[PDB]
């Protein structure tokens, strides 16, 4: 009715990868960066407490935490892998976070390997009847109150 509120916010998850012309002493073959960012004219820091990137167990300190922008991780590696990415919200009630499963891929679907790639994934979050305090952070971050 007139009494309910729905707020929608958008996130982008992305990465780039480049094949090194010289493998490292460990045989790492690629340089890659994974990032989480808001869209044009959006500052996700107002409603995001932190972004956690869960790296594969082979990496040093695999849980990478970003408490302020830019939310990103830079690493050198030899294989693609699935990376949980958790976005923790500045909300005292549920939901406290949202979890994505991101494919950190170093080569495209086509069988031949490539020299470099990048990828962007868009995600829309919807919040129904969020708390007075959380609602403001969502909107202050470039969020959209859904008009009936």
């Amino acid at each position: 009715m007139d009494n309910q509120c729905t707020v929608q916010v958008r996130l982008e998850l992305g990465h780039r990868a480049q094949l090194r012309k010289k493998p490292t002493t460990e045989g790492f073959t690629h340089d890659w960066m994974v990032f989480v960012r808001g869209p044009e004219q959006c500052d996700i820091q107002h409603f995001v407490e932190k972004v956690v990137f869960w790296l594969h167990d082979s990496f040093p300190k695999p849980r990478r935490v970003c408490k302020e922008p830019p939310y990103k991780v830079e690493e050198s590696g030899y294989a693609g892998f699935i990376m949980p990415i958790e976005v923790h919200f500045k909300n005292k009630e549920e939901p406290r976070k949202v979890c994505f499963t991101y494919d950190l891929f170093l080569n495209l679907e086509g069988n031949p390997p490539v020299n470099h790639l990048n990828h962007l994934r868009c995600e829309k979050l919807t919040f129904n009847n969020p708390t007075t305090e959380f609602r403001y952070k969502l909107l202050r971050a470039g969020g959209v109150m859904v008009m009936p």
Binding site: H56, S58, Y78, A79, G80, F81, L106, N107, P113
Partner: peptide, 4 residues
């Protein structure tokens, strides 16, 4: 290529 190689996945882990």
């Amino acid at each position: 290529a190689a996945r882990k």
